[PDB]
Amino acid sequence: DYKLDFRRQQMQDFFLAHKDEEWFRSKYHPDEVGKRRQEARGALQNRLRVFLSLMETGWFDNLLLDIDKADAIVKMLDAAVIKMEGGTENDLRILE
Amino acid sequence: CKPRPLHKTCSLFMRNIAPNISRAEIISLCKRYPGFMRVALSEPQPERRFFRRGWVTFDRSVNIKEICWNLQNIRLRECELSPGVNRDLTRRVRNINGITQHKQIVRNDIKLAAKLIHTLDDRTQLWQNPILKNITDYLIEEVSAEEEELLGERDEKLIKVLDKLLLYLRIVHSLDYYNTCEYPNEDEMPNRCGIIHVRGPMPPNRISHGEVLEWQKTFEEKLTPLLSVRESLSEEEAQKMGRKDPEQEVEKFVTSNPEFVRKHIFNKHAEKIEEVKKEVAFFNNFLTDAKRPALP
């Protein structure tokens, strides 16, 4: 059996060759995987807050995903990013 | 107080960045220019020996052309960055086929969107979701069959439901529905909410009988990759490749490093025994995964 032994070499060569690199550590290393998901869920919860903020404020109250309201969507998407960065209702005024 | 242009962000772009280079040194390189915000790296690609595409984002009140020139002939760990000024997105709101604003196909998309949100809320572990309350009411047909039996196109009520689901998918989970793709790193990259996809104007000819069903088969086929669980080898296949046992290789570390020597390592040096177990799991997670990074 060669193919079995061949895939062992390639795998183990790659684990050696990319052991200490950031991207590889982040995918598989227990410490870095855990600290990645905390950042992810922390940043995702920030995006959830923004969606719930845009709901009650009514930024997509009369807004359908259609090219007739293409300019209205862009105006909303800007307001989404402003709230992600953390701007108040004052900071949104430049869109008006 | 003056209002800020927080939606606008000018940024740099780097074509080839090495895999051994982390965010740390790229951030601290670009940190000392005022108005710096965040660095974003792409997923490395095996075709270029796992090289990453970078994106250094700056504030709008900054001259990016000077800062791009400043770092133009500057290397970092035997790798020339050579940035270029990443221009803004021109065409954001893009079209798709006009068939997707139909009664039956919107109902189909509400079912699939509801399925995606259930899955993504479990996967990410947020929260229950208020936009998924009484969605089952909108999935069922409601018709006057008896009044036809005895005697004998747009539906905005369904579309307004769909939009709240599709906007949630896009804004929260970075999932553009109609294009059928994720934008996973968006929250670090310069434009946080870039390209959204939108329904077409309208079909010129009649809406065909079987063509509506053929779209639903094709559209659901593209969405199924987005809810893909990460692969794993079988118990025998993983063991034959060489799954290292944690407690066994801890014993190999102790014997290499008689009875008084073993009681010293476990009790005093408690940090090392877990560090070996972590690097075993580091290797086993890479082994178990049946979709590894490797040279093509």
Give the C-alpha separation, B21 to B51, whole Å: 10
Q: Name every residue whose Cβ is closer than 8 Å to that of residue B94 and which is 6 or more positions away in sequence.
A: B179, B195, B196, B197, B198
Torsion angle in degrees (nearest 10) through CA of B114, B182, B289, B222: 70
Closest-CA residue in chain B for A1? B240
Q: From the CA of A30, how many Å to the nearest CA of chain B?
A: 6
Sign (positive or negative) of CA dihedral A85, A86, A91, A94: positive
Contacts of B126 in chain A (CB under 8 A): 41, 44-45, 48
User: Are the C-beta atoms of residues B30 and B57 closer than 8 Å to each other?
Assistant: no
Q: Phi and psi (nearest 5°) for A51? A: -65, -45
Q: Where do we find the tokens 């998407």?
A: A77
Give the C-alpha separation, B26 to A43, whole Å: 21
Q: From the CA of A22, how many Å to the nearest CA of chain B?
A: 6
Q: Phi and psi (nearest 5°) for A58? A: 85, 50
Task: Tell me whether residues A8 and B242 touch, CB distance under 8 A.
Answer: yes
Experimental approach taken: X-ray
User: Which residue, B122, B8, B6, is CA-closest to B64?
Assistant: B8
Question: How many other CB atoms are found less than 10 A from the CB of residue B249?
Answer: 14
Helices and strands in chain A, H and E counts: 5, 0
Give the C-alpha separation, A8 to B243, whole Å: 11
Q: From the CA of A37, how many Å to the nearest CA of chain B?
A: 9
- Total length of chain B: 296
Q: Name every residue whose Cβ is closer than 8 Å to that of residue A15 and which is 6 or more positions away in sequence.
A: B283, B286
Crossing angle of helices B259-267 and B246-256, rounded to 10°: 120
Give the C-alpha separation, B55 to B42, whole Å: 8
Give the C-alpha separation, B196 to A74, whole Å: 9
CA distances B14 to B26, B133, B182, B183, Å, are 11, 45, 22, 19
Per DSSP, what are the bridge partners of residue B38? Answer: B57
Closest-CA residue in chain A for B280? A29
Sign (positive or negative) of CA dihedral A30, A36, A39, A41: negative
CA distances B209 to A20, B108, B109, B214, Å, are 57, 15, 18, 10
Give the C-alpha separation, A45 to B124, whole Å: 10
Give the C-alpha separation, B45 to B51, whole Å: 6
| A49–B contact, CB cutoff 8 A | no
| A72–B contact, CB cutoff 8 A | no
H or E element at residue B11: strand B11-17
CA distances B177 to A51, B92, B105, B182, Å, are 16, 14, 14, 9
Task: Tell me whether residues B293 and A18 touch, CB distance under 8 A.
Answer: yes
- Please give the span between the terminal C-alpha atoms of chain B, in angstroms, as a whole number: 56
Sheet containing strand B52-58, edge to edge, reads B36-41, B52-58, B11-17, B84-86
Give the C-alpha separation, A60 to B45, whole Å: 38
User: Mind giving me the DSSP string for B173-235?
Assistant: T-EETTTTEE-TTTTTSS-SS---EEB-S--SSPPPTTHHHHHHHHHHHHHGGGGPPPP---H
Contacts of A29 in chain B (CB under 8 A): 278, 282, 285
- Among A4, A41, A81, select the one facing B193 at the smallest CB separation: A81
Interface A-B, measured as beta-carbon pairs within 8 A, has a size of 145
Question: How many other CB atoms are found less than 10 A from the CB of residue B4?
Answer: 19
By three-state DSSP, how is residue B51 classified?
strand
Task: Tell me whether residues A80 and B41 touch, CB distance under 8 A.
Answer: no
Task: Tell me whether residues A48 and B286 touch, CB distance under 8 A.
Answer: no
Burial class (CB in 10 A: 0-12, 13-18, 19+), B2: exposed
Give the C-alpha separation, B217 to B117, whole Å: 20
User: Which residue, B52, B48, B50, B28, is CA-closest to B40?
Assistant: B52
Task: Tell me whether residues B93 and A78 touch, CB distance under 8 A.
Answer: no
| A79–B contact, CB cutoff 8 A | yes
User: Which residue, B171, B189, B173, B226, is CA-closest to B55?
Assistant: B189
Closest-CA residue in chain B for A91? B3
User: Are the C-beta atoms of residues B87 and B12 closer than 8 Å to each other?
Assistant: no
Q: Are strands B94-95 and B197-198 parallel, antiparallel or unpaired?
A: parallel
User: Are the C-beta atoms of residues A85 and B59 closer than 8 Å to each other?
Assistant: no
Q: From the CA of B248, how many Å to the nearest CA of chain A?
A: 19
Helices and strands in chain B, H and E counts: 11, 8
State both tokens at B238.
């993983």
Task: Tell me whether residues B198 and A31 touch, CB distance under 8 A.
Answer: no
Closest-CA residue in chain A for B161? A64
Q: Are strands B181-182 and B175-176 parallel, antiparallel or unpaired?
A: antiparallel
